[PDB]
Amino acid sequence: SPEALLKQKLDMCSKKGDVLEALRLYDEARRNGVQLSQYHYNVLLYVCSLAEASSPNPGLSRGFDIFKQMIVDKVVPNEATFTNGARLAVAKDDPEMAFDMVKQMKAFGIQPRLRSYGPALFGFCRKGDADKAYEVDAHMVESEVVPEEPELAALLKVSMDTKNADKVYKTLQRLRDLVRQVSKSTFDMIEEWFKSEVATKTGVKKWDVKKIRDAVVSGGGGWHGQGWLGTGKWNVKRTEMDENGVCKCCKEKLVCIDINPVETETFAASLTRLACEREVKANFNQFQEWLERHGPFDAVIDGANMGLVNQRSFSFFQLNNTVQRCQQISPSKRLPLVILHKSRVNATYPKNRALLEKWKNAGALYATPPGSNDDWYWLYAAVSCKCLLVTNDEMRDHLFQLLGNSFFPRWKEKHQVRISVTREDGLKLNMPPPYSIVIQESEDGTWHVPMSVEDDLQTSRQWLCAKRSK
Numbered sequence: 001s002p003e004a005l006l007k008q009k010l011d012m013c014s015k016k017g018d019v020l021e022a023l024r025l026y027d028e029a030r031r032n033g034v035q036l037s038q039y040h041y042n043v044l045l046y047v048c049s050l051a052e053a054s055s056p057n058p059g060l061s062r063g064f065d066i067f068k069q070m071i072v073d074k075v076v077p078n079e080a081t082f083t084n085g086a087r088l089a090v091a092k093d094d095p096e097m098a099f100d101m102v103k104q105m106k107a108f109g110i111q112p113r114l115r116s117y118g119p120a121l122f123g124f125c126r127k128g129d130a131d132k133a134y135e136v137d138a139h140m141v142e143s144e145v146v147p148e149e150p151e152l153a154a155l156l157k158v159s160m161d162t163k164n165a166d167k168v169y170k171t172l173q174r175l176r177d178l179v180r181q182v183s184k185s186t187f188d189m190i191e192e193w194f195k196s197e198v199a200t201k202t203g204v205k206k207w208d209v210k211k212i213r214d215a216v217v218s219g220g221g222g223w224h225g226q227g228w229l230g231t232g233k234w235n236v237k238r239t240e241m242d243e244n245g246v247c248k249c250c251k252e253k254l255v256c257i258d259i260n261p262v263e264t265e266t267f268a269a270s271l272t273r274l275a276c277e278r279e280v281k282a283n284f285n286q287f288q289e290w291l292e293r294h295g296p297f298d299a300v301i302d303g304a305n306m307g308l309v310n311q312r313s314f315s316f317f318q319l320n321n322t323v324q325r326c327q328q329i330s331p332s333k334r335l336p337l338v339i340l341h342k343s344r345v346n347a348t349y350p351k352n353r354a355l356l357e358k359w360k361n362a363g364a365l366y367a368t369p370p371g372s373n374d375d376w377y378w379l380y381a382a383v384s385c386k387c388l389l390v391t392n393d394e395m396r397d398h399l400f401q402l403l404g405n406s407f408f409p410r411w412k413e414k415h416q417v418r419i420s421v422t423r424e425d426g427l428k429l430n431m432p433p434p435y436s437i438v439i440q441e442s443e444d445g446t447w448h449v450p451m452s453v454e455d456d457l458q459t460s461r462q463w464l465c466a467k468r469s470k
């Protein structure tokens with residue numbers, strides 16, 4: 001088959017980096033009247049990405065012609081298409097041509113992905129072209145493609161470069177809303193903003209206190225969204241919050257922001273849906289039915305994690321110590337729900353085995369079936385029982401990326417208990433903080449900005465306190 005032949009010869013070109021043979025074989029196929037499918041086009045886009053930048057080489061600038069033709073042909077793009085299209089646009093380094101690709105996708109009814117907007121946005125950011133960056137941003141907005149931190153930080157940086165205090169403000173609110181805690185680089189960038197001449201010079205001496213007060217009630221708390229307040233130089237300090245969310249520097253008590261229980265039942269349904277896709281339906285169903293018949297619970301334990309975190313092998317001591325300590329902080333002394341592999345319940349010291357059976361008899365242990373991923377079980381139990389989740393799982397794994405970066409991090413902060421162990425004292429339960437670890441804007445315009453960290457028990461979390469000295 002002549003379509004199946006072109007595949008064999010194109011498969012050779014990508015595994016050699018042979019761009020000129022692919023551009024010859026593309027033209028030969030058009031001579032032969034051979035129609036190119038998804039796979040043919042994706043391989044040519046990838047192969048063209050290997051060319052670098054005298055004037056444009058015929059690998060890159062031909063790559064966009066192949067892209068434009070693929071769209072005209074109405075060959076539906078898959079995820080490899082968007083990726084290769086993006087890395088072609090990255091290697092070219094022409095932001096205006098990157099953005100032209102996205103416009104073509106829009107005109108032909110194709111949803112662009114986040115990585116499609118990157119080369120454009122980041123290109124216009126490097127060149128200091130704020131108006132083009134903002135066009136790209138508005139196009140993302142209308143396409144319903146949600147920016148993550150890198151895109152937001154570029155918009156912030158370009159807004160700082162063009163003295164656009166209004167856009168800095170709006171982008172800072174978008175970081176709060178979407179990201180919550182900022183990477184090191186963004187954090188440094190926000191510090192720079194607050195120390196800058198433009199920030200010193202933008203503000204108001206007098207504003208309507210009630211209009212602010214109503215906005216605070218309106219937004220859920222911890223921000224108002226009405227613009228910069230106060231005047232004069234900002235006092236900008238790197239500081240920390242104490243255990244109660246009091247700023248060490250200015251003594252403001254940070255706010256604790258509620259979760260809307262409607263978002264929670266939505267999240268619960270999404271977990272069920274995501275889990276049923278990956279587990280054997282009847283296994284996850286069986287767990288749901290068992291859970292409806294048991295409880296109430298004050299806490300759910302990731303049994304594998306409590307047995308294995310900081311251990312060379314499974315410590316029943318550590319699991320048992322953790323069960324006992326959760327029971328002890330339960331106002332009515334409920335046993336926590338231990339989720340553990342059936343593999344692990346069957347361990348080899350008889351009194352430990354009998355305790356695992358007693359917890360199961362007490363309605364406080366569920367042995368997950370062989371093949372299952374425990375994570376879905378302990379997630380679904382904690383969410384549905386509206387209780388604490390005791391786990392030190394870092395949650396890097398692909399699974400957790402499916403849960404989203406808005407609701408689930410907020411839920412996690414309110415529900416997650418982690419264990420820490422010292423020589424001196426043994427095992428400690430680290431409880432959810434009595435405040436929200438998020439960018440906050442106070443009623444008089446004081447800002448607290450949390451840096452993001454891998455582990456906030458290992459490393460003490462840096463915050464920025466930006467307060468008007470007048």
Ligand SMILES: *C1=CC(=O)c2cccc(O)c2C1=O
Nearest residue numbers: 235237238239248249250465
């Ligand atoms: C916040 C305010 C302040 O005046 C001050 C002074 C000395 C040392 C500090 O850390 C701070 C501070 O964090």
Ligand SMILES: *C1=CC(=O)c2cccc(O)c2C1=O
Nearest residue numbers: 256257414432433434435436
């Ligand atoms: C926010 C505020 C608060 O006082 C509190 C107290 C106990 C447990 C919590 O999770 C919270 C909270 O999230």
Ligand SMILES: O=C1C=CC(=O)c2c(O)cccc21
Nearest residue numbers: 272273275276277281284285
């Ligand atoms: O779509 C579903 C996946 C798993 C599951 O347990 C389930 C369910 O229990 C009820 C309706 C839908 C689903």
Ligand SMILES: [Zn+2]
Nearest residue numbers: 247249250465
């Ligand atoms: Zn402060």
